[PDB]
Amino acid sequence: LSEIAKIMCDGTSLINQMKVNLLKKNSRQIFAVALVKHGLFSLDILETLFLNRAYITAYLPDYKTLAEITKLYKNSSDSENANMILCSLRFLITNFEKDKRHGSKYKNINNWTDDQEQAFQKKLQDNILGIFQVFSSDIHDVEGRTTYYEKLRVINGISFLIIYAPKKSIISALAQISICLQTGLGLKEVRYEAFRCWHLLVRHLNDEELSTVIDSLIAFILQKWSEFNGKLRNIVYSILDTLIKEKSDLILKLKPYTTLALVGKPELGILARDGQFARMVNKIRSTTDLIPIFANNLKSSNKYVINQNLDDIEVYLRRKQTERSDITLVLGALLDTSHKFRNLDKDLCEKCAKCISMIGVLDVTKHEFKRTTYSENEVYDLNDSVQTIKFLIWVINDILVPAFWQSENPSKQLFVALVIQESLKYCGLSSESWDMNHKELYPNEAKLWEKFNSVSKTTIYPLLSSLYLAQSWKEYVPLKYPSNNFEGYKIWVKRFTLDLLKTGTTENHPLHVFSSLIRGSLSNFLLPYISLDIIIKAPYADILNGIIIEFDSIFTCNLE
């Protein structure tokens, strides 16, 4: 026990203060978790450790957040002992139960508690949130402790989570952990067993899933083929085999594009391994105008997927034309590709231009599907409370969904969970949309919220922190002048904080404002929908607060 004393002293005169700080760290650090896995689960022994060199208050209080992942980060044939120890550590999360005989009883034999078979379900689905927060902090931050040792261990642990997780906590942040493992695999060294993990996912997930993550992998593999060794190719083959066998309708009917590309890449032996697979693939292909399919694939942004799209589109167009023979949308797709590229990666832009070379000006009479407008539609946020419901669902479905899905932003998903559940109190009982005759009939399923329907119907954890922003409200000169001076991003932030100023009704506006409260273009999109309340009112303080900027920016210091 004096080893910690020596370590702190090397850290001396205030070594007691050092011990206090280190104990504070160990409250949620891996100290409690690893002691639990090493010695036992007795909270009395935990107090004994709290008296090893002193520093016990946080024991009951700090029993949940970070020690959960700290324990999770060791999930790694004889270690079944460690597996049961860890699973028992998972059993014991409740600090009160730790104080109770449960404290020394949750490390019992295999036949552990059985009310835990649902209470423990609730427990794990709760701070799956926190442990994901931990791991994304371990991955997508700066991590001056780069140390992909952590990445490896976290991958091991999350794989064991696939080994043991209910559908609900799975989908709690399936897509998030997908992005985490995805950027892992993107990183060089991870792949060696990142693909192992991918296979572990493959062996048992779902049917509705196995879409929103698989194409990324497909693009990766059918793109980087050069730098794949023997055994990488071997595991790849196993993966192909699993793809063929355990979930065939997905590759054949629910995402056939991958099959198109891989077959058109003829150094793989798809027909050699399975000639029956080849038949079906080719049939469906020659059968349904692949142009809209490539259009949907170009709607996946990223980079690898876009490149695969471009190449395969070129090949298809070439062969079809050499023959003799909708057609339009690829052109505008490429337009956006280049437009985003217009500042990033000239090679991608040149690929878009090569596809446009194959196509070209063609005919203008041939109707161009360029749209007319978009949805800035309203739905009585004041009256017709049903239309207010429409208002909120419109807000969440329109753009909050992909942001809540495609964003690479750890903390923002916290607000996602919080305020989206706060919006989901309109469907708070899970069985409303889940097993019941209940007529929740939730709209805007979007196949993503539908993918999230159960995972958000009653997975609500409040997470409602926001404070101390009222007085400094940049409004009336503090806003018009700041925007006319510079900066503009913070100008938009301040303006949209007109809700923090004088809006935020607890009905809808409070949660709506606190939504982006984590805080970047979304500001402009959300901005149009504020001063209507006051201009209804017939208040004047916030009215001027807004109007000052909203009319001074008319010609605010041009020709700066």
């Binding site: 500042n343 990033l344 990666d345 000239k346």
Partner: protein, 106 residues
């Protein structure tokens, strides 16, 4: 001649500190002229090559005629050019790399 050409070089100091690499946006679509490239390349090089040749005629002059030329202006002007040349934050450029370092040798 010498100073005149070093500060000629600082009139063409816009060469040896071209960036570390072609950025994702920086294009190589071009008028594709090797003309003014080779122009200024000959210029810069030949000029450093002056530096070389006349400075080595200095070194091969009688030892008597030495310190009469060396002032801190040599340090500062050649310091400008060296910093311009053996970049640690741009593209290095083997010829100028040569020349500059042999001036160090000088």
């Amino acid at each position: 001649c010498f100073l005149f050409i070093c500060d000629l070089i600082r009139i063409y100091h816009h060469v040896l500190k071209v960036p570390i690499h072609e950025s994702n946006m920086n294009l190589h679509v071009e008028p594709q002229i090797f003309q003014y490239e080779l122009i200024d390349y000959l210029i810069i090089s030949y000029s450093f090559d002056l530096l070389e040749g006349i400075l080595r005629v200095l070194q091969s002059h009688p030892k008597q005629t030495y310190m009469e030329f060396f002032d801190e202006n040599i340090l500062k002007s050649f310091e400008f050019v060296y910093k311009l040349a053996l970049t640690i934050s741009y593209k290095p450029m083997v010829n100028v790399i040569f020349s500059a370092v042999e001036v160090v040798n000088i």
